[PDB]
Amino acid sequence: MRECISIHVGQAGVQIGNACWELYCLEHGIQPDGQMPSDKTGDDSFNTFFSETGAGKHVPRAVFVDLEPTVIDEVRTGTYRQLFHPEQLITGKEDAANNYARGHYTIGKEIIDLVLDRIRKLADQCTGLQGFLVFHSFGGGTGSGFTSLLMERLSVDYGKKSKLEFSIYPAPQVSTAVVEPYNSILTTHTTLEHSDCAFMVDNEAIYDICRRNLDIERPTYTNLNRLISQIVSSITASLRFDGALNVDLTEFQTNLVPYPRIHFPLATYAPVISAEKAYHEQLSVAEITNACFEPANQMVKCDPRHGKYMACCLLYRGDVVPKDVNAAIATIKTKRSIQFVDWCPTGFKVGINYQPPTVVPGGDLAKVQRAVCMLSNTTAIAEAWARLDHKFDLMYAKRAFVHWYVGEGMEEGEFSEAREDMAALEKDYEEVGV
Amino acid sequence: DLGKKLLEAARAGQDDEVRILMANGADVNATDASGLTPLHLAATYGHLEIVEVLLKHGADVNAIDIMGSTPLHLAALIGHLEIVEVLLKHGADVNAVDTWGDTPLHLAAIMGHLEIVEVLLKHGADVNAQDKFGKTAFDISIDNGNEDLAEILQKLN
Amino acid sequence: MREIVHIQAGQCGNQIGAKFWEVISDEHGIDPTGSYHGDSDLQLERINVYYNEATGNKYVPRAILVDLEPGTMDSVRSGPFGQIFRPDNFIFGQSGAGNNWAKGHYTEGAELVDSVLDVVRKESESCDCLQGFQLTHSLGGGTGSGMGTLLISKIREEYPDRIMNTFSVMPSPKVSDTVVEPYNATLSIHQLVENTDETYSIDNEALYDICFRTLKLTTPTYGDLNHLVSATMSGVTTCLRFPGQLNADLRKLAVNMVPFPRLHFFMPGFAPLTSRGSQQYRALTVPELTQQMFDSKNMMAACDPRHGRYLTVATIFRGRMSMKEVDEQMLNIQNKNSSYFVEWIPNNVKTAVCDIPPRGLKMSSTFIGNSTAIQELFKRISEQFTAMFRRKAFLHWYTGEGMDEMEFTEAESNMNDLVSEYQQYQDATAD
Amino acid sequence: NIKVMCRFRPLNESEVNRGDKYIAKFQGEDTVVIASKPYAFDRVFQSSTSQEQVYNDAAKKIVKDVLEGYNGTIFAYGQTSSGKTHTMEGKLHDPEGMGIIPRIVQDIFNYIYSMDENLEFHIKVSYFEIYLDKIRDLLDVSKTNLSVHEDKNRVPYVKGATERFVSSPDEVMDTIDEGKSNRHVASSRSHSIFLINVKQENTQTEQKLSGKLYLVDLAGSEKVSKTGAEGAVLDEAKNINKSLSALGNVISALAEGSTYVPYRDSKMTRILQDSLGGNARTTIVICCSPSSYNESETKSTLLFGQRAK
Numbered sequence A: 001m002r003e004c005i006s007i008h009v010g011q012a013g014v015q016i017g018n019a020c021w022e023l024y025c026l027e028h029g030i031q032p033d034g035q036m037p038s039d040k041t042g043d044d045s046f047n048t049f050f051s052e053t054g055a056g057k058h059v060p061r062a063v064f065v066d067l068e069p070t071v072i073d074e075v076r077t078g079t080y081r082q083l084f085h086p087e088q089l090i091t092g093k094e095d096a097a098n099n100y101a102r103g104h105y106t107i108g109k110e111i112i113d114l115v116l117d118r119i120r121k122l123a124d125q126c127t128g129l130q131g132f133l134v135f136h137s138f139g140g141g142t143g144s145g146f147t148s149l150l151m152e153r154l155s156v157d158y159g160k161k162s163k164l165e166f167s168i169y170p171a172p173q174v175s176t177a178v179v180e181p182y183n184s185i186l187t188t189h190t191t192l193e194h195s196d197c198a199f200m201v202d203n204e205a206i207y208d209i210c211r212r213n214l215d216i217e218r219p220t221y222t223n224l225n226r227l228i229s230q231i232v233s234s235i236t237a238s239l240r241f242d243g244a245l246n247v248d249l250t251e252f253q254t255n256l257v258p259y260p261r262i263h264f265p266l267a268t269y270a271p272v273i274s275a276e277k278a279y280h281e282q283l284s285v286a287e288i289t290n291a292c293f294e295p296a297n298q299m300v301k302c303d304p305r306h307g308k309y310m311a312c313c314l315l316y317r318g319d320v321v322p323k324d325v326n327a328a329i330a331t332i333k334t335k336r337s338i339q340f341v342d343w344c345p346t347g348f349k350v351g352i353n354y355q356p357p358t359v360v361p362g363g364d365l366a367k368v369q370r371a372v373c374m375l376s377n378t379t380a381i382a383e384a385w386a387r388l389d390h391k392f393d394l395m396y397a398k399r400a401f402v403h404w405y406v407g408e409g410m411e412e413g414e415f416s417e418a419r420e421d422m423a424a425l426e427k428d429y430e431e432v433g434v
Numbered sequence B: 001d002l003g004k005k006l007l008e009a010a011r012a013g014q015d016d017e018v019r020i021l022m023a024n025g026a027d028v029n030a031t032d033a034s035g036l037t038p039l040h041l042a043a044t045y046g047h048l049e050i051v052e053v054l055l056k057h058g059a060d061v062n063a064i065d066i067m068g069s070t071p072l073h074l075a076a077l078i079g080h081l082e083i084v085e086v087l088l089k090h091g092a093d094v095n096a097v098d099t100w101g102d103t104p105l106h107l108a109a110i111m112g113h114l115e116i117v118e119v120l121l122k123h124g125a126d127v128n129a130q131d132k133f134g135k136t137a138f139d140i141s142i143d144n145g146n147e148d149l150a151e152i153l154q155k156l157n
Numbered sequence C: 001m002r003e004i005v006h007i008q009a010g011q012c013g014n015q016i017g018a019k020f021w022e023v024i025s026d027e028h029g030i031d032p033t034g035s036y037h038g039d040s041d042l043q044l045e046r047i048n049v050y051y052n053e054a055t056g057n058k059y060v061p062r063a064i065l066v067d068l069e070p071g072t073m074d075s076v077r078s079g080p081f082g083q084i085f086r087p088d089n090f091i092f093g094q095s096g097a098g099n100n101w102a103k104g105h106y107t108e109g110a111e112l113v114d115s116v117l118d119v120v121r122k123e124s125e126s127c128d129c130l131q132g133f134q135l136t137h138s139l140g141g142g143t144g145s146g147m148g149t150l151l152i153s154k155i156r157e158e159y160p161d162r163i164m165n166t167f168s169v170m171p172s173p174k175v176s177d178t179v180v181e182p183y184n185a186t187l188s189i190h191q192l193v194e195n196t197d198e199t200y201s202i203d204n205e206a207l208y209d210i211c212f213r214t215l216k217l218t219t220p221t222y223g224d225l226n227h228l229v230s231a232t233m234s235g236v237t238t239c240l241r242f243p244g245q246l247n248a249d250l251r252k253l254a255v256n257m258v259p260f261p262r263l264h265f266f267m268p269g270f271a272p273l274t275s276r277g278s279q280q281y282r283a284l285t286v287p288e289l290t291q292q293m294f295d296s297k298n299m300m301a302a303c304d305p306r307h308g309r310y311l312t313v314a315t316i317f318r319g320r321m322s323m324k325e326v327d328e329q330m331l332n333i334q335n336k337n338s339s340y341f342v343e344w345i346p347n348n349v350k351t352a353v354c355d356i357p358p359r360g361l362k363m364s365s366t367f368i369g370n371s372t373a374i375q376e377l378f379k380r381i382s383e384q385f386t387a388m389f390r391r392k393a394f395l396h397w398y399t400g401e402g403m404d405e406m407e408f409t410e411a412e413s414n415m416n417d418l419v420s421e422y423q424q425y426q427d428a429t430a431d
Numbered sequence D: 001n002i003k004v005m006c007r008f009r010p011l012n013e014s015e016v017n018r019g020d021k022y023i024a025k026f027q028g029e030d031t032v033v034i035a036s037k038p039y040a041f042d043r044v045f046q047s048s049t050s051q052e053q054v055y056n057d058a059a060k061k062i063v064k065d066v067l068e069g070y071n072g073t074i075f076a077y078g079q080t081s082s083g084k085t086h087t088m089e090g091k092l093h094d095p096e097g098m099g100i101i102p103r104i105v106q107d108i109f110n111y112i113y114s115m116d117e118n119l120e121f122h123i124k125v126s127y128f129e130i131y132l133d134k135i136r137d138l139l140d141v142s143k144t145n146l147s148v149h150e151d152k153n154r155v156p157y158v159k160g161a162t163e164r165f166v167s168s169p170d171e172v173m174d175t176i177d178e179g180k181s182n183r184h185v186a187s188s189r190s191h192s193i194f195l196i197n198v199k200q201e202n203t204q205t206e207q208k209l210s211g212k213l214y215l216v217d218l219a220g221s222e223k224v225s226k227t228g229a230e231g232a233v234l235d236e237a238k239n240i241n242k243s244l245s246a247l248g249n250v251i252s253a254l255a256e257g258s259t260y261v262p263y264r265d266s267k268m269t270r271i272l273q274d275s276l277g278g279n280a281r282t283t284i285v286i287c288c289s290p291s292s293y294n295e296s297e298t299k300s301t302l303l304f305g306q307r308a309k
Ligand SMILES: Nc1nc2c(ncn2[C@@H]2O[C@H](COP(=O)(O)OP(=O)(O)OP(=O)(O)O)[C@@H](O)[C@H]2O)c(=O)[nH]1
Pocket: A009, A010, A011, A012, A013, A015, A016, A066, A067, A095, A096, A097, A098, A099, A103, A136, A137, A138, A139, A140, A141, A142, A143, A144, A168, A169, A170, A171, A174, A175, A176, A180, A203, A221, A222, A224, A225, A228
C-alpha cells in the first residue's frame, strides 16, 4: 500500500459513503466492528482502504464531514458506530441551506482547518498515499460549496496526489432545492482544475433503473444508495484487490482521461436484477457485455451513439473466463457502431476479479454469477452538462435567487465566470467529438 | 377670528362651543386654508348633531374644498350612515365629482360601506360615473373581487 | 437549525398564537401541564424546534406573549393551554394602542420594547442553533402592527443572520373595527417588505368569504376565522416540526421560496376546508386534495391565482397515502396548467408528504404559494389607503404621536412599487 | 440613456520588470478583445487617449445638461491600481494632467460668470459615503447614519446632508479633499457619492433651475473566498458586493426599458433614483489594467460594464 483516503461531504456524500463501506466490509469479510476471522492474509489487498490496529481491527481510511449533525449522528449510532475513527466523523451545527456560497466560505471556513488536520492524521498513517476519493452531491450547499473549498485546500497540501470524485448529479424526483443548478455549475467551475477524474452519478438514471429493473414504485435514498454503492464498489475493486487494470489512482487518469478537462467518464453496470424476481437463468459474458452498450444501464442519462469514445474499460467480476470476454468484445466491435476519436486507440481495456459479486443480504439486488462495469469516456456526457446549463441560464437571466449568494459573500460575476467555464467545457466536447 | 374657532369646534365635536361661537356671529360657512367648512369637518368626524345644527342655520350642503370634496364625499368615505342620509335629505349632490374623479359612490364602494352604497344608489348615484382611470364603482367591485358589493351594484333592476 | 423563537403581539396575534400552541401541542402529544402523553417517537423527534425541555420531563413553548392592552394576558392564561406558557415570557403593558400604528410603533410600544427584547435575548442565548423568529400579529390594529414591526426591526439589528418569519393578518371591512386599518396595514407592509424573510399573508377578507360563502356561516365570528388560521398554521409548519427532507428549516424554506428579496409574501392554501364541529363522512382522495389546495376557494389570501403566475410553490400532503399517486397528481397539475408556473424557474414546485394527519382529518394538504397574484391583496389595501390619505382623514391621530406625514407617502410609494414588482415578473418571459 | 466607457492605463515601473505581456487587444473604438472573446462598449479609451479626450466623450454633455437644469450621473469603477484616481482627479492643479472632476468644475465656473446679466447662481456641494449600509456625511463627522426620505412627490432625497456653498473651482477641490480624509479605507471599503447642485434664478424672468450632478466613486467587487475577509471587513465586502448587484439590476432594467426599475435594491440606487430616471444621461467609466496578471480582475471589471449595457 499504496493507500487511498475516502472523503464523504454532506448528506449525499455521507449516505453513499455508508453504503459503500457496508459493501466493502461484506466483500473483504470485515465485521461491522472492524474484526476479521481465521483467514487474515500488512500484506493484504484491502490494506489500501483499511488500516489495521492492535486487536486485529481493520479501520476504513475514511473521513465524513457535514455542516449539520443529523446524518453523521446516524453513522455514530448505527450498525457501523465502531467501524470508523470517531474523530474522522466531523460535524458542524448550522448547514449551508442549499447555498454553495455558505458551504464554500461563510460556514465552511469555520470547520475547514479541523477537517484538514483530521485528514493529515490519516495521511500520516500512510506509507505511500496515492490520493483521495471524494463523495458529494452537486446540488447541496455542503456537497457543492464545502467540497470545492476542500478540493482547493487538498491541492495545496497534497500537490502530487490524485483526486477522484463521485458526484451526485441532481434529478427533480428527489431534488430538495430550486437552486440545485446554480450549486452544480459553481462547484464544477471551482473543482475542475483540482480533480483528475470524476464519476457523475445521475440520480434520475439510478431512479429509472430502480423503477424498471428492481420494480421499485417510488425509489427511496436507501434504494438509490444500495445501487450506487454496488457500482462504486465495481469501480474501486481494482484498488482493493491485486488485479492488473486500474491498480492505482494515477492509472484511472491514464486509462480514462487523455485530455485534462474532459475528465468525466460514463459508468454502465450490468446486470441489475431484482432479488424478488425468481427464477431466471444466469446471464453469460456476452449478455452482460452487450448490456454495457444499452443506454438504460448507464449512471448518467445521455446517448453515447450520438457522441465519440476517447477511452473504454471493462471491469468484470465473478465467473468470467478470459477467452469468453475476448469473444464478446470482438462481437461488440463488429455488430455495434462504437466510434472512437481519430487520435485515441480503438481498444477495450479488460480487468477480471474472480470473486463472486457481493450484495447486501435482504436488499433489492439479486446475487449474480458474473457482473461488469464499463468505464468509458464519451463526448455524449456533454448532454448532461447542457441540461444543467439550460436551467442555470433560465434562472440567471432573471438573476432569480442570486441575492442569497451575494448575501453570503459571493460576487455576482462568479456566476458569469462559472457559466463561461461551462460554455468552454461544452465547446471542448464539441471540438473533440468532430 | 371666530371662523377659525367654529372649524375647530365642529371637528372636535364640541356641540356647545358650536352653538356659543355661532351666537357671537361666527361664519357658518368659514373655510380653513384648504377650503374645508365646519360641515365638511363634522361630516368627516361623525358628529351627527353638529351636521344637523349647521344645516338648520345656513351651511352650504354642497360646499367644495380645494380638492372638490363635498361633505357627502367625506361622510361616504368614513362610513357615517346617518350623516349621509341627513346630507341627502338636505339636497346634497349624490353625484358630486372631486379632483380625483371620485363621486361618493366610488368612496363608499372602495371602503366597503355597503349600507351607504345602497342608500346612495336609491338616491340616484350614477353607476356609470368613471374616475380619472376610467373606473366606475362596479369596475372597482370586480377588480377587487368584492362579490357582495358587485351584487348590490348590479341590483338596480 | 433547531430552535425557533415564537412571538405573539396584540389581541389578534395572541388569539391566533394561542390556537397555534393548542393545535401543535395536540399534534406532538403535549398536554396543558406540559407533559408528553402521545404514542409515537415522531412527535418528539423535532420537539425542540418549538419547545424547551424543562425539569421533570416537561415541555414548555419557546413563546413570548406581548400586548399593550391589559386583559390579553388574563384571556390567554384562562385558555386551555394558558398554564403551559412560561410566566416570565408574558410582557404586558396597561395603556393600550387604540388601533393606532404610531402608538404601537413610537409611543406606548417604544416604552415596552426593551423589556420584550430582554426576554427574546434570554430565549436566544439558551438555543443550541437558533433558526430565527416567528411572529403572529394583525396589520390593522396598533400593537400587533406598530409594535410588532418595531420588534421586527429591533430583532433584525440584534440578530441579522437569523430568519424572520411572520403570520400577518390582513384587515378587511367585512370583519373591521375601523377606517384607519388601511393606514395601519400599509404602514406595517413597508416594514415587512424590508425586514422579513418570509410572510404568510392571512387575509381576513378571504377567511370571512370562506366562512360565509363556502361554510355557509351567516354571521362568521373570530372563532370561525381562527379555525381556518389554526389549520393553515399547523399545515405550513409541518415540515419544521416533523422529520423530512424538504424545507425542514426556516432558511431552506426561504432559499426555496424567495427568488427576489421583496417578493416574500405567501399565499397559504388548505384542503379540506371545514367548519368547527363538522363531521367528516369520507376522506379526500389524492386527486381531490391536489385540485382543492390549488383552488382559489381554498386560498387564505383573497387573490385569484389565475390572475397571476407562480414563482415557487411548496405543497405538503398529510396522512397515509401513495407517494406515487402524490407524485403523479403534482406532475399533472403543473403540466396541465404550465402557463401558470414561471418557465424561468425550473422545478419550482416542491412536494413533501408527512405520515401524521392533523386532528379530525385522515387526509390533508397545505399549499404555500409565492404568486404574482398576491399584488391583488396589496392593490385592495393601497386603494383604501389612497382613498383615506388623499382626504387626509385622521392624519393628526398619527402625527400627534410624533410621526411625520412623509412616512405615509413613503409607505404608499413602497406598496405601489411592490405591486409594480409583482407585475414585472408576471409579464417576464424566458426569451 | 446609459453609456459604458472602458479605459486602459499605460504600464507602470512596478510591473514593467515583472515581465507581464499585453493581454489587451483592441477593435475599432468600442471593442476590446481579451482571450479571443470580444467585449463591446459605448467607447474604449486606450493608453494613448488624453484626459481631455476622455472628459469630452464621458462627461462634457452631462455638464451642459446640468447647467441647462437637467440631472446626470457619472460612475467610476475599477480595482486597485486600475486608474480611478488619475481618470477622476489626476494632477488636480496641472492643466494637462487633470482628470474628470477638475474639468467638470472648470466648465461649470466657465458658464457661471459668463451669464452675469439677469442670472443669480448658487453652487451647493454634498459628500457622503455608504459604509456598512449606512449613509455617512463626509462633510460633518457627527452625521454617521443619514436616512433616505421622500418629498410629497415621492422623490428620494438624503435628509440632513451637509450642503456646502462653493463660489470657486478651488473650493470644490478643498471640499473633495476634506471628505476624502473622512472616507472608510483599509483601497476603499465604501461607495462614495459627490453631489454638485447648480442652482440658478433668472432675476427678471423669475424662473428657477436646479440641475444635479452626481459623481459616484465605486469600490471594486471583492471575492471574499480570496482575501479571506472576516468580521467587519466581511460585512464591508458583502455590502460593497450587494450595492454593485443592485446597481447592475438598476442599469440593466433601464437599458432593457423595463416598466419596473429596482431602485429599492440598495440605498445607493435610491439616492440616485431621480438622477438615473427620466431625462437624465448616465456614464459608467470602467478603468482596466492591461497586465497579463490582472486578466482575472480586469475580466471582472469588463463583465460589470457588460451588465450595464
Ligand atoms: N443518491 C442520493 N442522493 C442524495 C442523497 N441525499 C441527498 N441526495 C441528493 O443531494 C442533493 C441535495 O444535497 P445534500 O447532499 O442532501 O445536501 P448537503 O450536501 O448536505 O448540503 P446542505 O444541506 O445544503 O448543507 C439532491 O440532489 C438530493 O436528491 C442520498 O442519500 N442519495
